[PDB]
């Protein structure tokens with residue numbers, strides 16, 4: 001009876017910020033943060049290690065990293081359905097990214113950049129396809145695309161304060177942005193989960209700094225939710 | 229309601245020879261051969277490849293092969309439990325190994341001979357717990373039948389099994405695989421991430437003496453074992 005809405009958007013688009021803003025604005029409203037952002041305790045010590053290796057050597061470590069990331073996401077999102085919103089009136093949980101951006105943006109990207117050979121890729125896909133066919137549970141009631149140019153998205157990357165991330169190209173973001181535009185806006189991308197061809201989507205221009213001014217976003221957020 | 233029985237032992241000790249004989253005695257018994265055995269569908273290509281990839285460079289492919297081998301088992305065992313044995317009156321499902329074979333025999337040996345690194349093995353264990361408890365609950369065993377054999381018999385049998393890419397698969401390896409079965413199934417040193425297993429019955433068969441035409445004492449022991457359940 002909880003509505004599930006994934007917030008999607010290229011690295012540094014403004015998600016962790018928007019999802020936090022939104023948390024403060026209702027008791028029916030809860031977030032699930034991104035675990036690799038938690039990495040970015042048994043899981044922390046492990047994601048901690050693989051993400052570092054992800055950087056140090058990506059073609060050895062990408063499979064291992066995509067599989068754990070997804071496992072941790074699924075684990076974290078299930079923990080949220082229990083821990084919250086048992087009582088509330090119109091409960092909403094805002095997932096920070098989804099199992100679907102795990103496969104069709106990041107892992108895909110890694111494959112296309114040759115960080116996963118075909119066996120790793122078809123093994124991951126099998127792994128992903130089977131696992132999530134077991135579960136309607138985490139299935140998304142809707143999506144909010146938080147759209148931000150790599151121009152915007154590089155301009156935003158600098159500020160955050162993280163030793164591990166400071167080096168990331170722009171061309172990279174143009175693959176993800178492209179991967180993001182094709183799935184969420186241009187709406188072409190094929191997926192093996194059919195309902196992703198018909199889940200309600202909302203695209204919000206997150207270009208302007210929305211930290212000191214966000215009401216307009218939230219209205220469309222609220223107006224979007226009153227339709228699902 | 230269906231009984232689930234795991235058949236455990238060393239590479240080419242005869243778990244397929246036994247399992248292949250038990251399925252044919254009774255309408256009510258069926259068999260779930262392990263994933264890996266078949267690897268010597270897209271899971272077939274996936275499996276042959278990851279298998280040869282791992283031979284060359286265990287240190288590179290142990291985590292991958294290992295995670296793939298055990299998802300494929302959880303899947304196969306679940307399908308039989310919810311598919312096969314439709315109206316048997318006394319229903320027994322014999323597994324060719326189990327998801328403890330995978331982890332506490334094969335994953336442990338590979339981690340402990342440095343084909344998996346610390347992070348690889350700790351992720352594996354984390355995934356393994358969770359793959360079983362979301363998806364693998366109704367695979368809980370009612371017993372284990374352990375084909376116990378000395379480490380030497382097996383190499384001979386790999387020459388008999390003909391398998392060329394294990395043509396001279398090392399002796400020393402079989403000997404390693406051999407000491408973890410004892411601890412697990414003979415003494416109970418190897419306590420595990422799994423509560424019910426401590427109090428789970430185990431039938432042990434010394435199968436050094438060849439038996440492919442003389443399996444009736446061994447088959448008598450199983451029927452006795454099944455009744456205490």
Ligand SMILES: CCCc1sc(-c2cccc(OCCNS(C)(=O)=O)c2)nc1CSc1nc(N)cc(N)n1
Nearest residue numbers: 011036054055058066069070101102106113115172
């Ligand atoms: C931004 C912190 C997490 C990292 S580190 C990283 C990375 C590290 C080293 C190399 C790399 O790119 C792989 C090679 N492609 S390339 C630059 O065209 O040669 C990516 N990608 C990522 C994003 S992949 C990802 N997958 C998920 N499933 C979830 C999630 N948040 N991120």
Ligand SMILES: CCCc1sc(-c2cccc(OCCNS(C)(=O)=O)c2)nc1CSc1nc(N)cc(N)n1
Nearest residue numbers: 264282283286297329330334337341400401404405
């Ligand atoms: C079909 C052959 C599968 C292979 S290949 C392989 C292998 C190949 C090359 C080197 C290698 O070295 C391991 C070294 N450990 S040692 C010599 O005992 O100290 C192992 N181990 C294995 C067994 S891994 C495994 N995991 C399972 N879960 C199930 C199963 N039947 N087998």
Ligand SMILES: O=c1ccn([C@@H]2O[C@H](COP(=O)(O)OP(=O)(O)O)[C@@H](O)[C@H]2O)c(=O)[nH]1
Nearest residue numbers: 011012013014015016017159160209210211
């Ligand atoms: O409109 C914005 C959005 C984000 N940030 C800052 O940029 C850094 C990273 O952005 P964010 O975490 O929003 O990106 P995400 O990874 O969440 O998309 C953080 O220190 C934010 O405070 C900002 O200054 N203005």
Ligand SMILES: O=c1ccn([C@@H]2O[C@H](COP(=O)(O)OP(=O)(O)O)[C@@H](O)[C@H]2O)c(=O)[nH]1
Nearest residue numbers: 239240241242243244245385388389439440
């Ligand atoms: O009592 C036996 C047990 C095994 N084998 C031979 O040992 C080889 C390997 O046995 P299997 O494939 O059953 O071993 P698993 O790995 O499944 O234990 C086969 O060629 C069998 O013919 C045999 O001749 N008599």
